[PDB]
Amino acid sequence: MFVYLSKRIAMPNGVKVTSIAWNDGQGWLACGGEKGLLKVLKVDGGPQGQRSGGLSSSQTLEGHDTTVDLVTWNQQYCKLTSSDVSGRIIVWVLHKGMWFEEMVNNRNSSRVVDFAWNPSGTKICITYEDGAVIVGGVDGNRYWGRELPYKLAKVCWGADGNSILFGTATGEVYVHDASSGEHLSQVEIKCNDGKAPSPLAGLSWHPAWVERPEPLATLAVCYQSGKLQLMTSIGDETPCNVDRDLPAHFISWNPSGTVLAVTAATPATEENGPGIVTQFFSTEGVHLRTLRVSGKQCGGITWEGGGLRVAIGVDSSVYFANVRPNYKYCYFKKTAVFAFTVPDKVEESVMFWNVNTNERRTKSVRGLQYMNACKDACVLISRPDTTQQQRMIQLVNAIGSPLETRFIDMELYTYDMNSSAVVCCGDESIYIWQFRDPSTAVDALDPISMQASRAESQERVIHVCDLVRGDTAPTMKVRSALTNDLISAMCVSETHMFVSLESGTLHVYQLSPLQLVSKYILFARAQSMSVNCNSTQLAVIHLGGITNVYCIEREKFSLVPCKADTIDGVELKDVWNLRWAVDDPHRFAVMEKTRMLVYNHGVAEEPVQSCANLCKFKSLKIRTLQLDELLLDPERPRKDYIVDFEAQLLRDMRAVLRDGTAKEAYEFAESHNTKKLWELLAEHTLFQLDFTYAEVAFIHCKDYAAIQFVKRVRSLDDPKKQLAEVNAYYRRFDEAERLYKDVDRKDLALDLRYRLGDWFGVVRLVQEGALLFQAWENIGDHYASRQKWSKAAQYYTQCRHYRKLARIFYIIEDYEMLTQLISMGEHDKELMVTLGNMLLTVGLAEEAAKAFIAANEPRMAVNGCVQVNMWNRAIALAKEHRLEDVGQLLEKYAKYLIHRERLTEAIELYRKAGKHDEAATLLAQLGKRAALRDALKAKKFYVLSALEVQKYRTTAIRTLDAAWRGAEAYH
Amino acid sequence: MHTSVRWSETADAVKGIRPPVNSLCYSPSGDYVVASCGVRVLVYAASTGTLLHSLMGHQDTIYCVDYSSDGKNFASGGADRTVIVWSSQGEGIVKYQHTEAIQALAHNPTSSQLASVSSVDWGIWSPEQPKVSKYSLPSKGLCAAWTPNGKTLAIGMLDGTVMMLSKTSEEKVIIRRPAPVWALAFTPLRENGIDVLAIGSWDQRLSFYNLSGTAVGRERELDFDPCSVSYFNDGEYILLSGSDHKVTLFTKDGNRLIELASADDWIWSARQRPRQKQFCYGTNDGTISCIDITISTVHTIYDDQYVFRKDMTNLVVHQLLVDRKMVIPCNEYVQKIATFLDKLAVQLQERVIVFEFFYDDDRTMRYQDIAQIRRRLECSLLCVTTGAIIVSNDKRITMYDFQGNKRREWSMESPVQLMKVVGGMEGREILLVGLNGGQVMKVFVDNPFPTLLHKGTAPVKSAELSSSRSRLAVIDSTNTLQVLELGEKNELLFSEDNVTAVAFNIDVDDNIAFTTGDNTLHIKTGSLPAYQQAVRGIVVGFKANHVFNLHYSNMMVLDVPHAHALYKYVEMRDFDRAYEVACLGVADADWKMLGLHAMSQLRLDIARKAFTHIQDTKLVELLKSLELRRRQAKDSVLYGSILAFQGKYNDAARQFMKTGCELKAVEMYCDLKMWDNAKKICTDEKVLKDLIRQQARWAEESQNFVEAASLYESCGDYAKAIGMMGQAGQVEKL
């Protein structure tokens, strides 16, 4: 994040400020000052009051006598609480822009130390130096009070809202219950040595992650020494303690919980002199940025409600330091990508947005740390586990489908990419992943995605100290040769790689092959770096906020550390964003403070007032995106957050076109000769049908397809149709269709709407006076590919595509309708076999057999009935279709019942089928097997065999007596 | 629930008697496992099971051993009527004897003092207070329990009465029990300020009383007499022991969940190692066994939905594509869950519940109880349907209805290992069964005869039927995966080695996800090679544009790169399937690459369809310029033309002269207006003259007439040369 001073406001009478509090609800900032001074400003946090820092309202308040020292807010009810040195506590209620006093209290015995609101905003904690603690309601009803034996120095509300943390003058931290007030626990402290008691400067817990699987380090316990310790729970034994040399005075969490700000007051002891210095840490204690203001004493610090501005009370004034958080985002291929944090998720959600179609694709990425883009690819570096130091590098396309992945086991700090490789850097090691062949040019036929997937990826790890040439083989060892100077910034060009060290040394490597081809020296370390389109120039943001452009020449490459030539005319301070033109090595946009300074050949331009983060600079156009408020509602991005700006040249060309001759535009283009000018000239001449003035512009643009297009419209002989084709040529079909309606030549308008692919438009044009079914089928195909089964089924029914209908019904288990399409497919063949095979897999054998009858093959119907074991249905199906092969089927059924030893089912089948002699024989087969051990059932078997052969006589209208002989054998 | 035996130690029998581990306690460090084995004190290492310390000194068996909550020192006492304080190394500083043999040691959790229980009075011993102030008691105490605050000490008694003498208030709270109190527990979690004092009374009753003695919750009836109490997982669950010779897990309200570990006899005391998932217990035979309770996760997945069990009593339901969470409290243990469509089945100890969820007009997912079966049944596999529940054990398949009634059964030749419901019409549903003989079959609810799918050699431990139900994946006991195109002949599409899990695509016909043994997920589409991800966990689902994956307790969604298969389809000129693969969502550059390769390979049909995704007319304008040429060698110009439109022209000219189409290249260079390149390629002097006269005509209006006059002179048309030259102004050569 970048912090730059934007405004200083001096309160009246020059009285030192001692208490500052900002309200999230409406932007009411509060200020306290000596001799009973209370002031309330209203600053508009919207874009009207963002660029200009609009101080909308002011109001002085009275009711305090001594120095106002404790001020706090309540956002839900927009209430204020104030105190003073005397001990007078006043709660203030807004009413028509007037702050009414609501209650005045004074213990008259002890000094009130701090306030504390619950995150719900319904309870207030009031502490005193003697240890007196009072808890009151939002209305003001007293809940309970306690008198702890020791003395209290700070207070904070627990994030859960059921507990309250207290700090002591000694430095001890005690967690108590919000209701009972009895001492629940004591928080361990590891940052402090524990030698002697020390006061604590800050104590705050940000409740933005109360619902979360893995809690972040929203707690903060920092002492007057400067030891900052971050904790994720009441008693976490792994505090993310990061120390700073400066001694803390006050701390403040940002409203999103991401950043914690610490303030210090450096006296005049050192060479820098006195001043207020603010450091900014992330949730992991990572030092983000430092801001220094000239001053002597600090009164306090607060954050804006939107978290984009910090009010700091210095001496007798306040400073509105603008804060630009390091938003992870990228833009490529008419697609904006960024990231955001859901409150209840450990992971971070990455959103992809094709702003030309407003289609949103959401990816879940755990521990995302960096992202970037180039050509038609994006790269995300993530930390899947914070415990173990492994970074995952992932290469995705525009929609978000991953293509490559690598894992590195070493701690990484800086990252970048180019069209052929991904480069990362730690303290002293540089990892390079060349996933592409740099010799091959990324083209439309062979994009970067195919070259990343198909081609072999070679990966290298090199150190900074060692000189590298093409002779050295690639290696993978993590060399830890301890150099005193470490890497600070890094950047990558198409052909060269640039490294800066904290000493000030800069190294220029080649990439293909990797050779350390040059060295340079700098004024100091580089906070950030950038490189022009053809590596001619370079931009560096230094530690001191001074940004410079350095000119680098290939013939100037010498291994001896030499001075770098600096391009004149560019010298800026507190720049927080940067881009370069894709086509112009000299033009580059820069966001400095609260405005944008477009450059061209080292000279500046008129500062355009803007606050949007910069995305892309291509063809004299600057596309950028307001990420300050888009991150307030990331789930529903809106196209109005994309803003297009033009440079001086493009605006001048537009003004020339608006009132001027085409010859003036032609001489403008011949004077400047950039591609966008020729394109714009040709486009305008097409729009006003200046046919003869566009081929010259296109051929200076060198566009063969546009030459063929204007040739085709020259062949066209119509004052109207040529204009219609021009409107179609520039994505303006909405009036091109009307132009076609003007001469009612729908034979071309329908063709245009079909080639566009707007099948809704195709239907909406064909309903009004065969292709209608085609458009319906295309719509149904789109819905099916979108996995929207209901509307796909509707459009398939409308277009009568029964096979896709069967697919939909099979997926949604609508078998009752699936068993109906047999009625509507008689004149075509494959459908019956298809849905019958579908039905037998489900097991609906009867309707499948009906379809097979409609398919004119009940043989495989009977085979499927056997497969589903509908033998009773199979025999009937074979009989009604004269399938005389019923003997084999009955034999299979008999063998199956023999294997399942169901003699009862077999004999019932035989007696219903009227089979007598071999049925009796098969009964006797088990009859003798029963007879060989216990034959009192065998005689019964023979008896009913004789009964069966007797019933054969009635069924009719050697073996005649042999059956009776067998029956009487066991009489 | 899985139970892991980290290590076991059994005391050797002495004079024919096995000494009992009467009590045991855990050090605050947790490394020292301290137990009172008869007379001896055994301090083991929980990480190794090594006897770190063997402490003697006592005269007889000790019923109480305590470790102080700070861990710096401890005290030992028992039936010898002596209490001795020992340091960290077990060095005795002061030895003192009491008038009564003690049976319960009670150190303050918030200070270094200790409570001594005698036959008539209870006293306080402190290192700073050698005198023991013994306040009289009605009789001999039994067991003493401390609150986490350390301000209240509950004292046991034979008659079940737990009396209190509050230091500040003269009011006394005594709670009556009908059975002797052997062990009472104060919870470490204070829910809303209340205290849950758990009493296990040997009349098969479990009770909860606060500091006021009022009954908290419902008193439960056990199957055993509780002997030891110890809270588990920060007071979430309570450990019990009794006649079942097992240590058993119970809820906060007293519901029995599951026995955690089994013993051979009465268990004296079981303690959980703090901050670890390990616990120890002491038995009468001297057998102590450290148990790592490895957490077993039960999960059911149907399409987008996902369920698991949290808190061992609650069923948590998660919707992933809409990301909607819901919790169903049941207050009882569940070890087998099932789901299908909107219906879900939960099996308790003796209770089976069926849940349903509805897409109401309020746009909220709620659960209601529709079917409830009170029977106790032991089954290996469970499957719910819209028609009936199916339980399976060994080889019997009992299809109970909504209210405990048999419907159908099968008896396979070998026991079944998997039970899944692929689907079908209600009452005609399909049930996939794979038995240990390598056979997988389609059991139908209506038909009592399984349908023959596949017979394999090795036992089938997991298998799956396609969304179209025309292909079947199956792994073996050797972890070899096979995919069969089912039918009258099960044709093997392919096989793979060392596959942990497999899944088929629910919405697309042929997409299969594997988890190989090296934790490398694989994704296959048709005959293409498998895209790899190298992600931990196994695949448990496969939708159209998502791949689900589960690792331990984490459940996450992958993403399906359709462009990855699109590249390979383009490489082998397999463009028909490439269009359908790309239709599931690919980037704009992918669509452009598809269209360009299609028009390079003369397949304009998919080229037309692929271009309606790009919003770039500067390529789609090309298509209309082809049909008129196609109506009336000839096809080579289509190959040659496209390279110029990309942005490079030399390659186009090279193709033009490869196919011999020189005149078209001359026309292209004439339209590109750089005439030197046309001079390179020109072959006929008539073409050269036409090119140079077109150049002269261009230079006529190109605002450079001095060269135009020379060009027109080179044309040979002298009249035009004079007419153009007359505007130049070079009178000298004029």
Q: Do B545 and A729 touch (CB under 8 A)?
A: no
Phi, psi of B163 (to 5 degrees): -85, 160
State the amino acid at position A228 in one-letter form: L
CB of B459 less than 8 A from some CB of A: no
8 A C-beta contact, residue B440 and residue B486 = no
Among the residues of A353-454, which ranges form H helices?
448-453
A699 vs B452, B543, B673: nearest CB:
B673
Q: Are A57 and A49 in contact (CB under 8 A)?
A: no
What is the rounded distance in angstroms from the CA atom of residue B651 to the CA atom of residue B23? 89
- Written as six digits, the tokens of A735 are 């009036």
State the Rg of chain B over Cα: 42
User: In whole angstroms, what is the distance from residue B108 CA to residue B151 CA?
Assistant: 8
**CB-based contact, A180 to chain B, within 8 Å:** yes
Out of B430, B467, B593, closest to residue A445 by CB: B593
Tokens of A37: 């001074």
Q: Which chain B positions have a beta carbon within 8 Å of A728's beta carbon?
A: 617
Residues of A in Cβ contact (< 8 Å) with B644? 704
- Per the structure block, which two tokens stand in for B174? 């005594």
Going by C-alpha positions, the residue among A151, A155, A135 that lies closest to residue A143 is A135
Closest CA to B673 of B655, B653, B697: B697
Three-class SS state of A1:
coil
Strands ordered across the beta sheet of B267-272 = B4-10, B287-292, B278-283, B267-272
Touching A: B residues 516-555, CB under 8 Å: 533-534, 543-545
State the pairing for strand pair B64-67/B144-146.
unpaired
- Closest residue on chain B to A394 (Cα): B533
Q: Do B564 and A403 touch (CB under 8 A)?
A: yes
Which approach determined this entry?
cryo-EM
Cis peptide bond upstream of B188, omega within 30? no
Token representation of residue B493: 């599409």
Chain B contact for A233, CB < 8 A? no
Q: How far is A152 from chain B (nearest CA, A)?
A: 22
Bridge partner residues of B505 (DSSP): none
Concatenated DSSP letters of A684-698: HHHHTT-GGGTHHHH
**What residues of chain B lie within 8 A of the CB of A702, using their CB?**
672
**Secondary structure (H, E, C), A477-499:** CCCCCCCCCCEEEEEECCCEEEE
Q: Do B545 and A787 touch (CB under 8 A)?
A: yes
Task: Write the CB contacts of A787 (distance below 8 Å, at least 6 apart in sequence).
Answer: B507, B543, B544, B545
Instruction: Give yes or no for B5 touching A (CB within 8 A).
Output: no
The tokens for B132 are 């023991």
Per DSSP, the residues of B593-648 read HHHHHHHHTT-HHHHHHHTTTS--HHHHTTGGGSHHHHH--TTHHHHHHHHHHHT-
B625 touches chain A (CB under 8 A): yes
To the nearest whole Å, the CA of A340 is away from the closest chain B CA by 17
Burial of B78 (0-12, 13-18, 19+ CB in 10 A): buried
Could you tell me where the beta strands, DSSP code E, fall in A231-389?
Answer: 242-243, 250-253, 260-266, 275-281, 287-293, 298-303, 309-314, 317-324, 329-332, 335-340, 348-354, 359-365, 368-374, 377-382
User: What whole-number distance in Å separates Cα of residue B725 and Cα of residue A184?
Assistant: 104
Contacts of A399 in chain B (CB under 8 A): 585-587
Residues of B with Cβ-Cβ distance to A180 under 8 angstroms = 193
Nearest CA in chain B to A788: B507
CA dist B25 and B55 (Å) reads 14
Lookup: tokens for B203: 């009349």
State the CB neighbour count (10 A cutoff) for residue B420: 19
User: If you count them, how many residues does chain B have?
Assistant: 734
**Test the A interface: residue of B525, B567, B608, B618 with most A CBs within 10 Å:** B567
The CA distance from B214 to B207, in Å, is 10
Euclidean distance between CA atoms A340 and B612, whole angstroms: 32
Phi and psi at A629, nearest 5°, equal -100, -15
| Closest Cβ–Cβ partner in A363, A702, A816 for B559 | A363
Q: Buried (b) or exposed (e) across A675-690, using 16+ Cβ within 10 A?
A: bbbbbbbbbbbbeeee
CA distance B309 to B335: 9
For Cα atoms B70, B74, B79, give the angle at the middle one, nearest 5 degrees: 145
To the nearest whole Å, the CA of A402 is away from the closest chain B CA by: 6
B interface test, pick of A355, A752, A785 with most B CB neighbours within 10 Å = A785
Residue from B580, B543, B572, B578 nearest B559 by CA: B543
Residue A319's closest CA among A47, A20, A40, A574?
Answer: A20
d(CA A225, CA A243): 10
| String of DSSP letters for A858-927 | HHHHHHHHHHTT-HHHHHHHHHHTT-TTHHHHHHHHHHHHHHTT-HHHHHHHHHHHT--HHHHHHHHHHH
CB of B637 within 8 Å of a chain A CB? The answer is no
Residues A885 and A888: their CA atoms lie apart, in Å, by 6
HEC secondary structure over A427-464? CCEEEEEECCCCCCCCCCCCCHHHHHHCCCCEEEEEEC
Q: Are A704 and B671 in contact (CB under 8 A)?
A: yes
Give A454's contacts in chain B (Cβ within 8 Å): 567, 571
B671 CB within 8 Å of a chain A CB = yes
Cβ of residue B189 closer than 8 Å to a chain A Cβ: no
Q: How far apart are CA B569 and CA B565, in angstroms?
A: 6
A316 in Cβ contact with A15 (< 8 Å): yes
List of chain B residues whose C-beta atoms are within 8 Å of the C-beta of residue A453? 563-564, 567
Under a CB-based contact definition with an 8 Å cutoff, are residues A921 and A941 in contact?
Answer: no
Burial A430-452 (b: 16+ CB within 10 A, else e): bbbbbbbebeeebbbbbbbbbbb
B563 to chain A, any CB pair closer than 8 A? The answer is yes
Place of tokens 């859960």: A160
Q: Which amino acid is at B661?
A: C
Partner B contacted by A59 (CB < 8 A) = no
Across the interface, whether the CB atoms of A399 and B592 are under 8 A apart is answered no
Best mutation target, A144, A238, A841, to test chain B (most B CBs within 10 A):
A841
The radius of gyration computed from the CA coordinates of chain A, to the nearest angstrom, equals 41
Strands B114-117 and A368-374: unpaired
Distance from CA of A883 to the nearest CA of B (A): 21
- B153 neighbors B146 (Cβ within 8 angstroms): yes
CA distance A705 to chain B (A): 6
Q: Indicate yes or no: CB of B556 within 8 angstroms of CB of A364.
A: yes
**What sign has the CA pseudo-torsion B568, B570, B574, B576?**
positive
Rounded CA gap, A324 and A303, in Å? 13
Rounded to the nearest angstrom, the gap between the alpha carbon of residue B612 and the centroid of all alpha carbons in its chain is 40
Look-up of token digits 């800066």:
A500
Alpha carbon separation from A811 to A838, B69, B78 (Å, rounded): 11, 62, 72
A787-792 contacts at long range (C-beta below 8 A, 24 or more positions apart): A787/B507, A787/B543, A787/B544, A787/B545
**Resolution of the deposited coordinates, in angstroms?**
3.5
Which token pair is A687?
Answer: 């729009």
Restricting to A residues 723-762, those with a Cβ less than 8 Å away from any Cβ of B are: 728-731, 755-757
| Chain B CB within 8 Å of residue A813 CB | yes
| CA atoms of B147 and B190, how far apart (whole Å) | 10
Residue A669 C-alpha, separation from nearest chain B C-alpha, in angstroms: 15
Name the strand (E) or helix (H) holding A826.
none
Q: Which strand ranges, in their side-by-side order, compose the sheet holding B416-423?
A: B416-423, B430-435, B439-444, B451-455
- Residue A905 contacts B, CB cutoff 8 Å: no
Q: In angstroms, how far is CA A490 from the centroid of its own chain?
A: 25
Give A24 to chain B, closest Cα distance, Å.
30
In sequence order, what DSSP letters do the residues of B320-357 get, joined into one string?
TTTTEEEEEE-SS---EEEEETTEEEEE-SS-EEEEEE
Alpha-carbon span A836 to A810, nearest angstrom: 12
Considering only the beta carbons, identify the residue of A450, A756, A844 that sits closest to B567.
A450
Angle between helical axes of A917-931 and A959-969 (0-180°, round to 10): 20
Q: Which residues 641-660 on chain B approach chain A with CB closer than 8 angstroms?
A: 643-649
According to DSSP, residue B410 is labeled -
For residue A708, the chain B residues in CB contact (below 8 A) are: 621, 625, 671
